[PDB]
A paper describes a structure:
In bacteria, coupling of transcription and translation coordinates optimal gene expression and maintains genome stability. Coupling is thought to involve direct interactions between RNA polymerase (RNAP) and the translational machinery to allow cellular co-localization for efficient translation initiation and to prevent RNAP from backtracking during transcription elongation. We find that RNAP binds the 30S subunit with high affinity and report cryo-EM structures of the 30S•RNAP complex. We next visualized the 30S•RNAP complex using single-particle electron cryo-microscopy (cryo-EM) at ~7 Å resolution. Strong density shows RNAP docked near the mRNA-binding site of the 30S subunit between the head and platform domains.
Numbering used by the authors:
A (entry chain N): 12 to 127
B (entry chain X): 4 to 68
C (entry chain 04): 57 to 105
D (entry chain J): 1 to 151
The structure:
Amino acid sequence: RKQVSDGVAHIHASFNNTIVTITDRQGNALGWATAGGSGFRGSRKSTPFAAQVAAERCADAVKEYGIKNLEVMVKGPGPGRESTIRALNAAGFRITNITDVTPIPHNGCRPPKKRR
Amino acid sequence: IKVRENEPFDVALRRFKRSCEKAGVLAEVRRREFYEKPTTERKRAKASAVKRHAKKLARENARRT
Amino acid sequence: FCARIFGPVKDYECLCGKYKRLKHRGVICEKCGVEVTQTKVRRERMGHI
Amino acid sequence: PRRRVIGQRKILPDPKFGSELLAKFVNILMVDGKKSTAESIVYSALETLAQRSGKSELEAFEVALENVRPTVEVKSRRVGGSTYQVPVEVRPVRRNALAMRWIVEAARKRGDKSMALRLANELSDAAENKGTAVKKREDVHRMAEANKAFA
RNA sequence: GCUUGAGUCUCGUAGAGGGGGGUAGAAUUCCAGGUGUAGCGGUGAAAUGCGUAGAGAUCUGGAGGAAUACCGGUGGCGAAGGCGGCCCCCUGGACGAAGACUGACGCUCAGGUGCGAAAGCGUGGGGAGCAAACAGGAUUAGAUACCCUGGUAGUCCACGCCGUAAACGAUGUCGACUUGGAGGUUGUGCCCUUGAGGCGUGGCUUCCGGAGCUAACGCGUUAAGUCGACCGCCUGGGGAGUACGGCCGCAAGGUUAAAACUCAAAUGAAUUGACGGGGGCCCGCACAAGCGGUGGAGCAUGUGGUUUAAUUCGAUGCAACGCG
RNA sequence: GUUCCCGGGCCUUGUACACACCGUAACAAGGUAACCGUAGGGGAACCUGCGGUUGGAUCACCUCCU
């Protein structure tokens, strides 16, 4: 639906969750896929193979729109970031450009309090 | 950051993402600030890296094996 | 173009890369005998097979 | 153990046919250490299996060997932190050894008559890829593909 | 009176130095609208909560608030604390080439004064993120602890009080003296700066070392080395860097700074082992690939136990059980 | 073949141990690094936030470029 070819696929592998989502060039979201909804709850949420299945979940149920050249703009320096990319290339897509527009602050706000 | 390589590729090659920062900005904005801490491990690290240079200066004179 | 057989490419030089200074005269590379001498004398280095 | 790079040694061949592999074939069939006893049985088996196969005691033994010969053998040689298996190309010194090993282990299966006829069965059956000897070999074959990727 | 001391002027230099203010941009939170799914968060695992009143996520637009990625460099400024975006206004400290001068105008110092991270409190604004007290789910024998969902003081700005510290390269301050290399960083003089250099002169700082000192480690031109000068501090630890009095304070306390009694230690550096769910390597059928056994069955022998008139005792994980 | 496993040995690393490994708070990285200062709280050790220091440990592996 809406007919889009260039699908901006924001893949955000944080630390223990990787979300893949193709949207419209404008901004109209198309379909999502997550390492937490496809299963793999655990240290598996922090694995690139789960990100490979995340790419597969973002490979089907999205052909209704039909994207070919997609702008895989990766966000958040996490576990995947390549296994997910080659999952999409082995899914039937042609990534026109892999961009690294990760959520980057100029050390704006303070970072969160976690891990020990 | 933004790699394209026209259309004959069948590969990602995010080698510039790593040549940019990748984990660079993350190392400071993933876990709390701690302000002074990183400074501490900077001194220890240098002591062992400069000693590596002293190591390169120690091997040049003999190493008769 | 051996260093053990022949040797010095630089004035008073151990080709292995241990003795460079021109203070070195005759001292070889014990591993592969490079007598630190004149590269000019390397126009007089005769070998055998 | 931790030093052995050495392979096999010389084995006394069969005093009839010029094949040491057939000699190896006697070494595995000779039960309780009685060589001569099991040997004359290799004879009464090789002849009859070759006739039920359709050819001579050398080529009907070869076409009945190509089917029970191993390809790979997955072994516990983990490299990463995960617990997996690694398909191993089996050495040439080991291929015929494992082929002729399962044929005699299959000669103890099918408890019909004398072992000379039981063996006469399992290798003749091996010539047509039917039976329990070749069936064993087929199962290991199935185990290879699910692991071949780690290079 | 004269100058190798201090210091000033003429000509220049770099910067997270300080006070006040303005501004740009990303991200997080929230609100409204377009789209859409059945999941989001997190942990070793789980769960409260959110959600079909369409959350999480994406785009556009907008209102607050804190802080400045890459540049980043045991790099820089400063008495110290402390402090990283840019700029405007005021302005300080440090240093250098070539000269002119008063002519030791120099140093330290109890009582005293000023600066004084963070935090607490009074007052006027304020709240995205995180977070004392507290509620909830659990690992657990228990949780007022590790973790997570919320959340107040606080975090931020300005005016004061408390005037406290590992305010520690633990190295007080000014001056003089003492073979070098690699650097980092900021200027200048001289020569063909023809080009990413060479030879000197000062500041700050790091590593390896010599003269020297010390218990050792090591510091080493910025010294723990050699002297002069000034102030403070110690006489075993605990008690205690605390109570109370002077002084100050709305509050939290702080500064100066004790005793009785008690023990016969307290402290520091450096090593050989014990141990490691720390690392490397080497050996043995330990394992990988196979054959043959005990255990399922019969016989023979021995032990615990039982029983009996008595069924010697010893050995009793490996190293007792076809052993005496 | 030494990565898995049982035992032995050499080198190295760390110890406030050598009397020699109600709650574990420090000493191995004590499996949540330690210590001082400030405020508050809790049966109690101490915990949380902030600044500072070294009287602190390993910088061993798994994947990519000549």
